[PDB]
């Protein structure tokens, strides 16, 4: 008839994502009741197909004769605010007198949270997340001595002008935030939301960010989504004569408003380098402690 | 009713299965097409249907006696097969789940068991030079090795310093071949995007590993094929220019 | 729903089964604690539960092509095994029923038939100086041999001048290769007392024996063991002194 | 709560024997009924494990 | 409740099987006795009911490797059998339908698949002296075999012109030795006559041809018998007279 009962019926366009579970309250660990011997036929809990690609759905009251548990452990420690809101180390810059490194009292730093192994693998665990941030800012000399200086850190999102100099034309700020803290003061802290493009931040890109051929030139991009490049990280003594000593600035993020989407298996193997999975090959190691024989402990 | 019998129909397809675990819904979640409030394009998509949407045999790799395991990255397994290839190189934009059927059958008096995961956005690694001093990059055959897929270098690490150890996290399913002789996956669109390019990224990978190897007596079949079929859910194409490939 | 399928939860004990036939319930008629018209003793006996009331694995028994076939008295099984042998000892009476699982499995190439038995009081009797005039009697090994059991002397007369070619009166189950790999007996306490010494009396024997012959061609298993596994049910202790034994 | 649970619910101490079967009056033999031809999948009377 | 486990009672006699596939009700017709409407004969017909209507073994051929294939006619093969065939000898008149139990089962390693199939009316043909000039006929016994049956001269022509290649339209049912172990066909009094005369003509031919060979490796089983059984239902004789033969 009209129209045709092929568009009428058909499911095409259908918005809503089909919920296979919902989730429920759990402030407590679950409670345990009480069980019971039990010797029947047909009724067998133990027996399970781990080809399914199941967890166990047996429960302990149906393996042993159980008492009555009343839980209320928490279980508020293992959530992901309460588990991410933890300041680690994610950057250390260097000022030195006169060195190898920057010898200008101005620094920049291409914002990357990895590169410090134990903020990294705790954060590698979900492959997307979407948080709001809380920086710190610690500065001091490299024995740890306070000294009376003056700093000016300076947030550069992408397609900012770059520092190219100690008293470049770009630390006006006109626009482009940045703090100024003297080494006398309490470390500075800033709020930070989430900034990225897309709705969550990726600690793994499985692609190119560019077309066209990929020969063995722009081989090193592969893995380099630009939605969590959120630019770099500038530095001033602040000008216009050189400092009168050295200085170390450490950078701590502490996560808040968390929420990780999809789990991933845990880092086993010793990173070594920034946003890029590469590994040692021939020292690969076991995931743990190894033994002599499995019949000994 | 029973639960190792199924059966699966998309567009013109069909695959059957006797011997079969529970088929997987990736993360208790069924594909669906993008809402007015998630995509951010202007562009009227199109959603060719019955045309793309179905079974795709793609590989077949021989399960010998001492394999590492293999892998392959979606969706640039298609990307030159079919007429969803086709959508997905004239258009910038691409939107898909998938319902991957990998199927290996032996005899009752074979053994082993095979690991099927799916991996979302599953980065590789390289071995550092050896000694872990070397920035190396993997060639475009070995991000995006496409129809006939690639052996892992190592296992036990999964070429990303990830172990294999803890794979049976995100959505899997074992072919144990006491037991089962077929896997089926079915993942909805996981990305942060509405949208992506469907050539530069890819946003996941299937894992083909064997754990406990395979193993037969002097019977007559050592030839063991682990065959891949997989079929395109739900697919949007948006962003039309003229036709572009790798 | 299946018959076939078994699990038996008793204390923290578990017995798994996927190839079994259905329960016995002895006589028609599930274990019970004792009343209070019944029991004569005036003592609060100890009704220990969990601790004793599970099940134990006592003896495995290497079933030869050519074997006659092996008995247990109970309860003398368990008198040093466990908790439940504690109370066994430091008290006088003693109350209790069974759930005997004997298990056995081979391949579907083996070929072969178990009879598993509950004969209660079963008095063991002796080959007669071999002429019949000889009025001797079996040591202690041979009527309360405990943990290992003891091997027949003849299997056709049952030792006793009683013919096994009518054992299956008593509460019985076959273990058929073909078919089944394990039997199940559940037994009440089967006495004409409320409560009984557990060391002097035993209430019954369990009689594992072949009738079809294990067989099985040059393959590659030919060890194949028989596992005797047991579980105290509503047992009650009373008379309390001091540890006393065989 | 009070008392504890795995005692109130508990069946230690139940004092009759779970009966599985009853008796029934048999002052004669059995009577035999009628029967025809039967030519059914799935009903079968003749097949048994011992 | 299951559909390959099947039982039939006739009489006194009964067929069990636990491999078959589901049973064949002929031409979609339960066979019944003759109405007083289709009827012309005025005798009022013996109908003996159990003493005729029950199964009857009257043949077993060994399936080798090579063979093309055996047929029946009916209801000439129990002529001489039982007390069926005493009153169809007495009588001039004959009705009934069968219950065909054709039989053969063997190992899970064996192959090969029988064809059990009801053509009604079979006449048989034939060579007409090998060029075609000749128009000789079958002898009695070909056309008549009775017990032990007849070999078919050539199988794919059904010895008639026919094609075996379309001999799945009557009722048929197929042995196929990795599935099924026996076929069950129930075929109805199939004539354009209320009654006939049972030993002139024959109502139908149950023809028993393999169409994928027999085959197996050197086992310890070359020896595979297929078994023919049949069983009248609803016979119905009249015109009596004396005993009358071939
Ligand atoms: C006043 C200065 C504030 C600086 C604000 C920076 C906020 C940046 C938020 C973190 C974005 C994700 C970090 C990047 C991810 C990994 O490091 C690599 N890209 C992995 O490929």
Same mark, same amino acid.
């Given at each position: 008839?009209?129209?045709?009962?092929?568009?009428?019926?058909?499911?095409?366009?259908?918005?809503?994502?089909?919920?296979?579970?919902?989730?429920?309250?759990?402030?407590?660990?679950?409670?345990?009741?009480?069980?019971?011997?039990?010797?029947?036929?047909?009724?067998?809990?133990?027996?399970?197909?781990?080809? +399914?690609?199941?967890?166990?759905?047996?429960?302990?009251?149906?393996? +042993?004769?159980?008492?009555?548990?009343?839980?209320?452990?928490?279980?508020?420690?293992?959530?992901?605010? #309460?588990?991410?809101?933890?300041?680690?180390?994610?950057?250390?810059?260097?000022?030195?007198?006169?060195?190898?490194?920057?010898?200008?009292?101005?620094?920049?730093?291409?914002?990357?949270?990895?590169?410090? !192994?134990?903020?990294?693998?705790?954060?590698?665990?979900?492959?997307?997340?979407?948080?709001?941030?809380?920086?710190?800012?610690?500065?001091?000399?490299?024995?740890?001595?306070?000294?009376?200086?003056?700093?000016?850190?300076?947030?550069?999102?992408?397609?900012?002008?770059?520092?190219?100099?100690?008293?470049?034309?770009?630390?006006?700020?006109?626009?482009?935030?940045?703090?100024?803290?003297?080494? #006398?003061?309490?470390?500075?802290?800033?709020?930070? @939301?989430?900034?990225?493009? !897309?709705?969550?931040?990726?600690?793994?890109?499985?692609?190119?960010?560019?077309?066209?051929?990929?020969?063995?030139?722009?081989?090193?991009?592969?893995?380099?989504?630009?939605?969590?490049?959120?630019?770099?990280?500038?530095?001033?003594?602040?000008?216009?004569?050189?400092?009168?000593?050295?200085?170390?600035?450490?950078?701590?993020?502490?996560?808040?408003?968390?929420?990780?989407?999809?789990?991933?298996?845990?880092?086993?193997?010793?990173?070594?380098?920034?946003?890029?999975? %590469?590994?040692?090959?021939?020292? +690969?190691?076991?995931?743990?402690?190894?033994?002599? !024989?499995?019949?000994?402990? | 009713?029973?639960?190792?019998?199924?059966?699966?129909?998309?567009?013109?397809?069909?695959?059957?299965?006797?011997?079969?675990?529970?088929?997987?819904?990736?993360?208790?979640?069924?594909?669906?097409?993008?809402?007015?409030?998630?995509?951010?394009?202007?562009?009227?998509?199109?959603?060719?249907?019955?045309?793309?949407?179905?079974?795709?045999?793609?590989?077949?790799?021989?399960?010998?006696?001492?394999?590492?395991?293999?892998?392959?990255?979606?969706?640039?397994?298609?990307?030159?097969?079919?007429?969803?290839?086709? %959508?997905?190189?004239?258009?910038?934009?691409?939107?898909?789940?998938?319902?991957?059927?990998?199927?290996? %059958?032996?005899?009752?008096?074979?053994?082993?068991?095979?690991?099927?995961?799916?991996?979302?956005?599953?980065?590789?690694?390289?071995?550092?030079?050896?000694?872990?001093?070397?920035?190396?990059?993997?060639?475009?055959?070995?991000?995006?090795?496409? !129809?006939?897929?690639?052996?892992?270098?190592?296992?036990?690490?999964?070429?990303?310093?990830?172990?294999?150890?803890?794979?049976?996290?995100?959505?899997?399913?074992? +072919?144990?071949?006491?037991?089962?002789?077929?896997?089926?996956?079915?993942?909805?669109?996981?990305?942060?995007? @509405?949208?992506?390019?469907?050539?530069?990224?890819? %946003?996941?990978?299937?894992?083909?590993?064997?754990? #406990?190897?395979?193993?037969?007596?002097?019977?007559?079949?050592?030839?063991?094929?682990?065959?891949?079929?997989?079929?395109?859910?739900?697919?949007?194409?948006?962003?039309?220019?003229?036709?572009?490939?790798?």
């Amino acid at each position: 008839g009209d129209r045709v009962a092929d568009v009428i019926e058909s499911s095409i366009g259908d918005s809503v994502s089909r919920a296979l579970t919902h989730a429920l309250p759990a402030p407590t660990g679950q409670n345990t009741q009480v069980s019971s011997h039990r010797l029947d036929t047909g009724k067998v809990p133990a027996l399970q197909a781990a080809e +399914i690609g199941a967890s166990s759905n047996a429960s302990d009251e149906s393996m +042993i004769e159980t008492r009555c548990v009343l839980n209320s452990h928490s279980t508020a420690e293992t959530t992901l605010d #309460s588990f991410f809101s933890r300041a680690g180390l994610v950057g250390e810059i260097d000022l030195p007198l006169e060195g190898t490194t920057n010898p200008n009292g101005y620094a920049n730093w291409d914002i990357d949270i990895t590169g410090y !192994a134990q903020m990294r693998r705790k954060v590698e665990l979900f492959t997307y997340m979407r948080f709001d941030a809380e920086f710190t800012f610690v500065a001091c000399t490299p024995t740890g001595e306070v000294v009376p200086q003056l700093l000016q850190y300076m947030f550069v999102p992408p397609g900012a002008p770059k520092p190219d100099s100690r008293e470049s034309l770009a630390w006006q700020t006109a626009t482009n935030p940045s703090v100024f803290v003297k080494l #006398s003061d309490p470390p500075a802290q800033v709020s930070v @939301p989430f900034m990225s493009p !897309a709705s969550a931040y990726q600690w793994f890109y499985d692609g190119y960010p560019t077309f066209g051929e990929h020969k063995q030139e722009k081989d090193l991009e592969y893995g380099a989504c630009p939605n969590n490049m959120m630019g770099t990280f500038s530095v001033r003594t602040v000008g216009t004569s050189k400092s009168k000593y050295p200085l170390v600035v450490r950078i701590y993020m502490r996560m808040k408003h968390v929420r990780a989407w999809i789990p991933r298996p845990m880092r086993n193997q010793n990173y070594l380098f920034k946003a890029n999975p %590469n590994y040692a090959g021939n020292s +690969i190691k076991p995931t743990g402690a190894s033994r002599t !024989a499995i019949t000994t402990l | 009713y029973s639960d190792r019998v199924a059966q699966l129909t998309i567009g013109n397809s069909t695959i059957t299965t006797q011997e079969a675990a529970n088929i997987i819904v990736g993360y208790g979640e069924w594909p669906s097409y993008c809402s007015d409030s998630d995509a951010t394009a202007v562009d009227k998509p199109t959603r060719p249907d019955v045309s793309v949407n179905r079974f795709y045999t793609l590989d077949t790799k021989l399960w010998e006696k001492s394999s590492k395991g293999w892998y392959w990255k979606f969706p640039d397994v298609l990307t030159e097969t079919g007429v969803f290839g086709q %959508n997905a190189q004239f258009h910038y934009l691409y939107r898909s789940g998938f319902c991957i059927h990998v199927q290996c %059958n032996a005899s009752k008096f074979h053994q082993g068991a095979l690991l099927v995961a799916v991996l979302p956005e599953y980065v590789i690694g390289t071995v550092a030079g050896g000694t872990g001093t070397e920035d190396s990059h993997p060639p475009y055959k070995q991000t995006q090795p496409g !129809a006939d897929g690639f052996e892992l270098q190592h296992p036990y690490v999964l070429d990303a310093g990830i172990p294999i150890s803890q794979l049976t996290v995100c959505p899997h399913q074992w +072919i144990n071949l006491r037991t089962n002789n077929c896997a089926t996956i079915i993942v909805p669109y996981i990305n942060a995007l @509405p949208f992506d390019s469907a050539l530069n990224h890819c %946003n996941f990978g299937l894992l083909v590993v064997p754990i #406990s190897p395979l193993d037969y007596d002097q019977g007559a079949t050592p030839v063991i094929p682990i065959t891949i079929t997989l079929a395109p859910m739900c697919s949007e194409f948006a962003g039309l220019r003229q036709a572009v490939t790798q």
